[PDB]
Amino acid sequence: AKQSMKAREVKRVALADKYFAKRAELKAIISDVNASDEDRWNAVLKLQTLPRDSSPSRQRNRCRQTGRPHGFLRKFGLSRIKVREAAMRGEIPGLKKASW
Amino acid sequence: NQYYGTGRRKSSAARVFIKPGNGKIVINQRSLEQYFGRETARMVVRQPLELVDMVEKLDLYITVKGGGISGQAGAIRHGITRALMEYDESLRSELRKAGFVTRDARQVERKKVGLRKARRRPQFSKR
Amino acid sequence: ARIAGINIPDHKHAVIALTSIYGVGKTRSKAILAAAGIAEDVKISELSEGQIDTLRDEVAKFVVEGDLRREISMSIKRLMDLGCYRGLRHRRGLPVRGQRTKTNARTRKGPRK
Amino acid sequence: RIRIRLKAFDHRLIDQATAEIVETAKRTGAQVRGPIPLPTRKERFTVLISPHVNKDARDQYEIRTHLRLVDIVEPTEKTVDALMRLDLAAGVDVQISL
Amino acid sequence: RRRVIGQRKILPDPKFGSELLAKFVNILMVDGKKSTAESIVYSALETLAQRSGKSELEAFEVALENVRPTVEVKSRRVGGSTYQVPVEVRPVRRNALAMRWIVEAARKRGDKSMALRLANELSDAAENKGTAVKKREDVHRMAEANKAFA
RNA sequence: ACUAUGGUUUUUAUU
RNA sequence: CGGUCCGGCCGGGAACUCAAAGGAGACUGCCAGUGAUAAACUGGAGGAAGGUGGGGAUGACGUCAAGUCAUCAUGGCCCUUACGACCAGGGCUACACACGUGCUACAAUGGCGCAUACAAAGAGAAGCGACCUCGCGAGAGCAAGCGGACCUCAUAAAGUGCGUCGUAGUCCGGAUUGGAGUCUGCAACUCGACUCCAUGAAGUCGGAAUCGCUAGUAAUCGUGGAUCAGAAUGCCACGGUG
RNA sequence: GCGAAGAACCUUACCUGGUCUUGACAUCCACGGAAGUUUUCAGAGAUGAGAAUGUGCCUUCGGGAACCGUGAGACAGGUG
């Protein structure tokens, strides 16, 4: 993935205190159907879906070596080809060829 | 004097002691009558003792652990042969000809990557 | 005899002689026969004359045959003065399943190309 | 009692970390629990063996973690203060509690 | 190619006393369910004696003699090999084939109640009409109509 | 030796 | 071997299990045959096992101007009011038939009710999940224990035992038309997973042809994890009977 | 059972309608605001405005980081 997408990779986590911390008590009740009336809070109802692309709904831990969101080893943060590449140098501590 | 033998079969592991004396059999520090006596042919605890024709001349003590109740008894078959080869030198060949001294490794081995059960490869058709 | 509608055989187990006919339900009929005291297990020989009609106010209750066929044909018929998404696919080889269209649809398309 | 944890990936480094707190103790006549290595942790990985196109051929790798607790009944400045300063041995994690 | 594997054998089982009774944990056994076949061993022969009771010395004297193999056929390719080559079977087949080599209806419309089935097959091998006749008696005419080569 | 038989595939970067 | 809540409970020690592992043993060596009294190959002996024991580990030179600059790496070449960068909605899931890759059934040693046992092997502090209530249930609330061989997922299924179907394209089989719900998400019409109850087709082993297999294998029945609103029959990890 | 372990958008190509052109990922120079809090109107939204309001960290008092804004060249950018 591009370096311009690697700048989006940090813009997507920049709203954590701006939209995703001051209304978290509302976020726990905003869609609960055990409540009076059919409308009670419309002036705050949209404020945590009002931000787009930079939302927890698009947050993914991603390959720390390619920017790809899929097909990577979460214990290393990177894909099969970069585990292979390091194993040919013996470079990952305690990691050794065996099948038991 | 006591004769000794062990046996292994599909996660089951047995050990057996045999003495010259009155005809008894005991298992797992308890009486045999408390969980044996319903087995449909009981060959695995009889046929080596039937080959040497001993009837009631030997006193047996057994310990067994691990796996399923059939393989526990099949593991004891090797214990009642290894503890029985010491009974008389001229019977060492007879238990061997009867197929009781030989063992096999037919129980399944370690998984070969990625083969589902280590002995079959993926299918195909057409050209 | 007379376990379901006017069907004249006195044959089959009490649930199998009542299920998969008249829309009365294949599993509903496994908690209904106790109105007539009829047991799910061991054969019947204590059944009094006309005691079998105790089931009529136990199946209806719910819709039965024609009232179920009308419930099924009513599915698209609550708005008809104006256009609706329920009508055009009802007369096409394209079902309302949200599925990949060019495979596994011959059961909706029928014979010939 | 004072208690320590010695953790490593290498099976001779874990014993080098043991030697600076168990031999240093036996060589002063200090009371010891004796040689106990404890059961070993391991985890397995399956890794694709081509860099390109081939998705079916793969190879396997192991990582094994050794954890010793050694036990201390006569703690000293030459042991419980010295294992937190060990520079001559790389790739080991020492943790201690009072 | 070069395979020379040792031949399989079975020992007489002391619960049934013979080698001919020792194979009904395999003949008409399915899905690896061996103790499910053990459930009906030798009691199936007492159920056969419910249909013709003549004791164990006569229990198989036609129910195997009428159905046992006698010839092995097919061609051998040596030029112009558009014929068949009949050879008489060896004594190691005297009790074989007749309880294994046909399933044409048993896997198609069943073969009646299982606990009664060996008492039916040991009676059908002594009735010798309809099913399993053609696959047996065809080689009693083939080996007389196609025998000019060996 | 060991069955008597079964025809077609555009010229083409060009190594 | 000793003591004794008479119990591995506890001093202490590995009988033999389990997990750690490491070693012995196999060399045609040894007795004979056959042969070019060479190597071989088959019997005998000692062996649990014998003649690469069976399985792993793997892939020498080299072709198809194979595919590939979406795994990288790179020279040249191309776009540059854009083929670059940023945005909203569409689209890629559009469908008149053709074929692989599979999957489920094509019932009656099949189906199910009730009672019972043993494998391995993995996940785990915005996580692994028991208990409890509310409800027909998905679920909504309430919420213990767990920091790993120590504690949640969690009474492996067939087989073992006691019983029951009604002979019928079957209580079979599943494509589907309806009714009513649970929940996420900017939103589920187009383009959703799950829950309860009405309805039910095709299907009875299959044609050229192409196919795995020499035995713990044909057959049959069981256990998790990566991905993580929703999503696979693939992948890797594992067993019981035969 | 393809490159490609999961679909409203996204990883993503393609298309239409908006928006920009030394752009902007990022480096040297320049340069104003704290990040933010309350809140209304247009637009499909990016953007573009209207009305309140905070003055933190750093603070050789000169001047910086966090988070934003905007300008000039050398340039480059590339989901080829």
What DSSP string describes D6-65?
EEESSTTHHHHHHHHHHHHHHTTT---------PPEEEEEEEES-SSS--S-EEEEEEEE
Which residues of chain B neighbour D46 with C-beta distances below 8 Å? 113
C4, C22 Cβ separation under 8 angstroms: yes
CA-based end-to-end distance of chain A: 37
Q: Which residue is nearest to nucleotide F4 (CA to C1')?
A: E80
Q: How far is the CA of E8 from the C1' of G34 (A)?
A: 29
Q: Which residues pair with D63 in a beta bridge?
A: A95, D43
Q: How many residues does chain B have?
A: 127
E73, E145 Cβ separation under 8 angstroms: no
The one-letter amino acid code at D73 reads V
User: Inter-chain contact E13–B40, Cβ cutoff 8 Å?
Assistant: no
How is residue A78 annotated by DSSP? B
Q: How many CB pairs under 8 A join B and E?
A: 7
- List subunits contacting chain B, requiring 3 or more Cβ pairs under 8 Å: D, E
Alpha helices in chain B, H assignment, sequence order = 47-51, 69-82, 92-97
Question: Nearest 10 degrees: CA dihedral of E26, E32, E34, E35?
Answer: -160
A47, A33 Cβ separation under 8 angstroms: no
| Alpha-carbon gap: E38 to the closest alpha carbon of chain B (Å) | 9
Nucleotides of F under 7 A from a protein CB: 1-4
- Cβ neighbours around D83 below 10 Å, total: 20
Residue A97 lies in a domain: no
Question: In whole angstroms, what is the distance from residue C31 CA to residue C59 CA?
Answer: 11
Residue A95 lies in a domain: no
The one-letter amino acid code at E98 reads A
Q: Which residue has the tokens 């629990």?
A: D33
Q: How many residues does chain E have?
A: 150
* Closest listed residue to residue E18, CA positions, set E75, E76, E59: E59
| Alpha-carbon gap: B1 to the closest alpha carbon of chain E (Å) | 33
E124, E98 Cβ separation under 8 angstroms: no
Kindly give the pairing relationship between strand B25-27 and strand B58-65. parallel
Question: In whole angstroms, what is the distance from residue E125 CA to residue C13 CA?
Answer: 38
Q: Number of folded domains in chain A?
A: 1
D7, D19 Cβ separation under 8 angstroms: no
- List subunits contacting chain E, requiring 3 or more Cβ pairs under 8 Å: B
**C-alpha distances out from residue A53 to A11, A26, A27, Å:** 9, 21, 18
- Resolution of this deposited model, Å: 12.0
How is residue A7 annotated by DSSP? H
User: Inter-chain contact B41–E35, Cβ cutoff 8 Å?
Assistant: no
User: Inter-chain contact D63–A94, Cβ cutoff 8 Å?
Assistant: yes
User: Inter-chain contact B41–E13, Cβ cutoff 8 Å?
Assistant: yes
Residue A2 lies in a domain: yes
Report residues 22-81 of A contacting strand H, contact meaning Cβ closer than 7 Å: 22, 43, 52, 57-58, 68-71
- Reduced to 3 DSSP states, what percent helix, strand and coil does chain C have, rounded to the nearest 5? 25, 0, 75
| Alpha-carbon gap: B113 to the closest alpha carbon of chain D (Å) | 8
Residue A38 lies in a domain: yes
Write phi, then psi, for B47 (nearest 5 degrees).
-60, -35
Q: Is B122 on the interface with D (CB under 8 A)?
A: no
Cis (ω within 30 of 0) for the bond into C61? yes
User: Inter-chain contact D62–A98, Cβ cutoff 8 Å?
Assistant: yes
Question: In whole angstroms, what is the distance from residue D72 CA to residue D82 CA?
Answer: 14
Question: In whole angstroms, what is the distance from residue E150 CA to residue A90 CA?
Answer: 70
D14, D66 Cβ separation under 8 angstroms: yes
Write phi, then psi, for C51 (nearest 5 degrees).
-65, -25
What number of CA atoms fall less than 13 Å from residue B16's CA on the CB side?
27
User: Inter-chain contact A94–D51, Cβ cutoff 8 Å?
Assistant: no
B58, B49 Cβ separation under 8 angstroms: yes
User: Inter-chain contact B40–E35, Cβ cutoff 8 Å?
Assistant: yes
Q: Which residue has the tokens 């945590």?
A: A48
Alpha helices in chain E, H assignment, sequence order = 34-38, 43-48, 117-124, 134-137, 142-145
Cβ burial C23-54 (10 Å sphere, 16+ → b, else e): bbbeeebeebbebbebeeeeeeeeeeeeebee
Residue A54 lies in a domain: yes
What number of CA atoms fall less than 13 Å from residue D1's CA on the CB side?
9
In a 10 Å sphere around its CB, with 0-12 CB exposed, 13-18 middle and 19+ buried, how is residue A4 labelled?
exposed
Distance of CA E77 to the CA centre of its chain: 29
Nucleotides of H under 7 A from a protein CB: 2-7, 9-12, 24-26, 35-40, 67-68, 77-79
Which residues of chain B neighbour E13 with C-beta distances below 8 Å? 41
Tell me if residue D5 falls in helix, strand or coil.
strand
What range defines the domain where residue A64 resides?
A: 1-90
E126, E63 Cβ separation under 8 angstroms: yes
Q: Is the CB of B30 under 7 A from strand G?
A: no
Sheet containing B25-27: which strands, arranged edge to edge? Answer: B3-9, B12-20, B58-65, B25-27, B30-31
Tell me if residue A97 falls in helix, strand or coil.
strand
Residue of D nearest to A82 (CA): D51
Tell me if residue A76 falls in helix, strand or coil.
coil
Q: Is the CB of D31 under 7 A from strand G?
A: no
The one-letter amino acid code at E16 reads F
User: Inter-chain contact D60–B113, Cβ cutoff 8 Å?
Assistant: yes
Nucleotides of G under 7 A from a protein CB: 16-21, 42, 46-49, 53-58, 67-68, 71-72, 85-88, 93-102, 107-110, 117-120, 122-123, 140-141, 149, 156, 158-161, 164-167, 171, 175-179, 183-187, 189-192, 197-201, 204-205, 210-220, 226-229, 235-242
Rg (Cα) of chain B, in Å, rounded? 19
Tell me if residue E130 falls in helix, strand or coil.
coil
Q: How was this structure determined?
A: cryo-EM
Specify the nucleotide whose C1' lies closest to residue A44 (CA): H39
What number of CA atoms fall less than 13 Å from residue D69's CA on the CB side?
11
Specify the nucleotide whose C1' lies closest to residue A82 (CA): G71
Q: How many residues does chain D have?
A: 98
The one-letter amino acid code at D42 reads K
Question: In whole angstroms, what is the distance from residue D82 CA to residue D88 CA?
Answer: 12
Question: In whole angstroms, what is the distance from residue A12 CA to residue E105 CA?
Answer: 69
